Design an enzyme around this catalytic site. Structure first.
Site, PDB file in Angstrom:
ATOM      1  CG  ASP A  16      -2.028   0.771   1.032  1.00  0.00           C
ATOM      2  OD1 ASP A  16      -2.413   1.371  -0.141  1.00  0.00           O
ATOM      3  OD2 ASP A  16      -2.595   1.439   2.250  1.00  0.00           O
ATOM      4  CD  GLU A  95      -9.834   6.354  -4.069  1.00  0.00           C
ATOM      5  OE1 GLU A  95      -8.807   5.639  -3.453  1.00  0.00           O
ATOM      6  OE2 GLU A  95     -10.772   6.648  -3.434  1.00  0.00           O
ATOM      7  CE  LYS A 131      -7.932   2.024  -2.981  1.00  0.00           C
ATOM      8  NZ  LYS A 131      -6.755   2.044  -2.191  1.00  0.00           N
ATOM      9  CB  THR A 155     -11.472   1.774  -1.501  1.00  0.00           C
ATOM     10  OG1 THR A 155     -10.710   1.947  -0.305  1.00  0.00           O
ATOM     11  CG2 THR A 155     -11.756   3.121  -2.217  1.00  0.00           C
ATOM     12  CG  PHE A 177     -10.525   1.276   4.851  1.00  0.00           C
ATOM     13  CD1 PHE A 177     -10.551   0.726   3.584  1.00  0.00           C
ATOM     14  CD2 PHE A 177     -10.101   2.563   5.046  1.00  0.00           C
ATOM     15  CE1 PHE A 177     -10.001   1.557   2.586  1.00  0.00           C
ATOM     16  CE2 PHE A 177      -9.273   3.371   3.976  1.00  0.00           C
ATOM     17  CZ  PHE A 177      -9.695   2.783   2.639  1.00  0.00           C
TER      18      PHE A 177
END
Lengths: 316, 316
Positions: A16, A95, A131, A155, A177
Site C-alpha cells: 500500500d 483511484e 478504485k 474501497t 478497512f
C-alpha cells in the site's frame, strides 16, 4: 522463517504505497495507491521526472489550462502506476477523483478516462483495478464498468450493507478497512485498547469473508488500512491484504511462522434476493461508525485531490 | 409584559408535545409531535382511553394481528392529534414511521394512510402537516404529496443542502433543529459553552431564514428543538418556533419585552438552478455534524416506533 514469508503461504501480499522502493524490497504481487499516497509520492525527489512528463504530455493534448490541470493530474497518477507495474507481476489500483463519489455517470466516465491513459501507454485492462468509493453510486458505477471489461477495487467499505451490495454487483474486489474502524471505536468508546481477536476492524472483515465464501461470491476480499501487525496476523488467510511499508518491515523482521485464521470449509449456500437501494440506505445508516467514516474518507481524499491540482497548477 | 407574550408579536408560537395540558396553558397556534413524544404521551393515564379506542378500532378493521398492530399504532397517533385539534386553531404535525425514511414510495403510501385516518374522523387536510425526515427520499416524497394536496413538515433538517432541496421542492414547512446542532458541537468540539448569538444551531437557522426570504420561497421556516430560552430569543422573528412546555413556562415567567432579531428587508432575488441528487449528497456529506445527526435522529425515532408497537402488541 519470518512472518512476511509465512503470511505468503495463506495470503497474497499487496503493498500500500506509491513508492517503488518498497516494491523492490518486499516483492508484492499487487500494489495499491489512493489520492493521499499519490500526493505524498509527488514529494519524492526521484519522481520529479514523472511530474514533468505529465505536465509536458498535458500541454501537448490541449491548450486549455483547465483541461491541462486535469490531464496533468490524471497522467501523473498513471505515470506512477506505470513505474510500479515494472516491478510487480500483478495489478495496480488507481483511484478516481473522490469528488465524483456520489455521481454514477461522472465516475464511469472518469474510470474510462484513466483506463484510456493506461491503454495509451500500452497497458491492458487485466493489469489494472479502478478504485472507487463504496457509496451506492460507486457500486452502481462499478457494476456497469465490470460488464465493459474494467475491473474495480471498491474501497472505503465499512458497513455490512456495503459488503453485500458489492458482492451482488459482481465487482472484482473489495477493500474493507480495518484500522479506520478501530480509530472510530477508540475515539467514540471508552475502550481504547483491543486484543487482536476483538479488534472491531478484524471482526468486521472476518464476518465479510465468511459471508462471501459461504455464498460462493468470486469477489476478492482484500483487507486494508492497518494500525499494527496484530490485525494483520489475525486475518491470515484473507484472499489478499494490502499493507503499508512500515508494517511490511515489521513482518519481515519478526521470526516465527504463523497460523491461518480465516477459513471457510463448508459448502456454498444459496444466495438471497438482491438488496435494494432503500434497504441498503437503511442498513448502512444503522451503523454509526460506517456513516461517519464513509463520508469522512471521501472528504479527505477530495482535499488531497485538490492539493495535487494546486501543485500541478503552479507548474503550468 | 412577559417574554412569551412579547415573542407572539413577531413569531407564531407552536407547542412541541403530545400533552393537551400544555395546549390549554399556552394556547399555541399549532402543535407538533414526533415518535418519541407519542410514546411518552401514551404513558399519560388520561390517555388510556385513546389507546383503548385505537385498539378497538383496529380489531374492527381486520382480523390480522400484524395489520392490527400497525392500524392500532397509526390510529393512536391520530387520536392524540384529534384531541389536540380540539384545543388549537392551527395545525397538528404527525410523523410517518421513521423506518421508511429512505423509501420514497413507502413514505408516500404511509402519509396518505395517515391522511386517510384523519379524514375518516372528519378532519380536512388544511389542519394537518405530515412530518417526514429530510433525506433525499423524504424530500422527493414530500414534493409529490404537496402536488396531491397534502402539506408536509420536513424535519431532522441539519445541512444547508437539505434546506435548499426542501425549498426547491416547494414543501409547506421545514423544521430545522437548533438544539441537536448545539449538542453535536458540545460533544465534538473543545468549546462547551456558546453565547446565544454564536450558538451553531442559531447561526444555522438564521442563515436558512435569510436564504429563504431572500429568494421569495414560501416554505414556512420553523425552528425546533431548543436547549435554553437564549436560543429562542435569538430567533425572534422566525416564521414559527415550536417549543417544549418546559421552555414555554420559562418564557411566560420572565418579564421584559424582547426585540425582533430575524428579518429580511431587501428585495427578492432570482432563484438558481435546482440542486441535483449528486450535488445534494456531496454538499450534505461535507457537513460532519449533519451526517451524524440525520442518521442518528432517524435511528432513534425508529426505535421509539418499535417500542410503541411492542406496547400496543401486549394489548391485542
Amino acid at each position: 522463517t519470518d512472518k512476511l514469508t509465512s503470511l505468503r503461504q495463506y495470503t497474497t501480499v499487496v503493498a500500500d504505497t506509491g513508492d517503488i522502493a518498497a516494491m523492490k524490497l518486499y516483492q508484492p504481487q499487487d500494489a495499491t495507491t489512493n489520492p493521499s499516497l499519490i500526493l505524498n509520492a509527488a514529494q519524492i525527489p526521484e519522481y520529479r521526472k514523472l511530474i514533468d512528463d505529465a505536465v509536458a504530455w498535458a500541454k501537448q493534448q490541449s491548450n486549455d489550462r483547465a483541461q491541462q490541470i486535469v490531464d496533468a493530474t490524471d497522467k501523473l497518477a498513471v505515470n506512477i502506476g506505470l513505474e510500479i507495474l515494472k516491478l510487480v507481476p500483478g495489478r495496480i489500483s488507481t483511484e478516481v477523483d473522490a469528488r465524483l463519489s456520489y455521481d454514477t455517470e461522472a465516475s464511469i466516465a472518469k474510470a474510462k478516462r484513466l483506463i484510456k491513459l493506461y491503454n495509451d501507454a500500452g497497458i491492458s485492462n487485466d493489469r489494472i483495478l479502478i478504485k472507487l468509493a463504496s457509496t451506492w453510486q460507486g457500486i452502481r458505477a462499478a457494476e456497469q464498468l465490470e460488464k465493459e471489461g474494467i475491473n474495480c477495487n471498491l474501497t472505503l467499505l465499512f458497513s455490512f450493507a456495503q459488503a453485500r451490495a458489492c458482492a451482488e454487483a459482481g465487482v472484482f474486489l473489495i477493500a474493507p478497512f480495518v484500522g479506520r474502524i478501530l480509530d472510530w471505536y477508540k475515539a467514540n468508546t471508552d475502550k481504547k485498547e483491543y486484543a487482536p481477536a476483538e479488534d472491531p476492524g478484524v471482526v468486521s472483515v472476518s464476518e465479510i469473508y465468511q459471508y462471501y465464501k459461504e455464498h460462493g461470491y468470486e469477489t476478492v476480499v482484500m483487507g486494508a488500512s492497518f494500525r499494527n501487525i496484530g490485525e494483520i496476523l489475525e486475518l491470515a488467510g484473507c484472499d489478499r491484504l494490502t499493507i503499508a511499508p512500515a508494517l511490511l518491515k515489521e513482518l519481515a523482521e519478526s521470526e516465527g511462522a504463523i497460523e491461518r485464521k480465516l477459513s471457510y470449509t463448508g459448502e456454498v449456500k444459496a444466495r438471497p434476493a438482491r438488496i435494494t437501494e432503500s434497504e441498503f440506505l437503511w442498513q448502512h445508516n444503522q451503523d454509526p461508525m460506517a456513516v461517519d467514516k464513509l463520508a469522512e474518507g471521501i472528504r479527505k481524499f477530495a482535499i488531497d485531490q485538490e492539493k495535487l491540482e494546486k501543485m500541478i497548477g503552479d507548474l503550468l
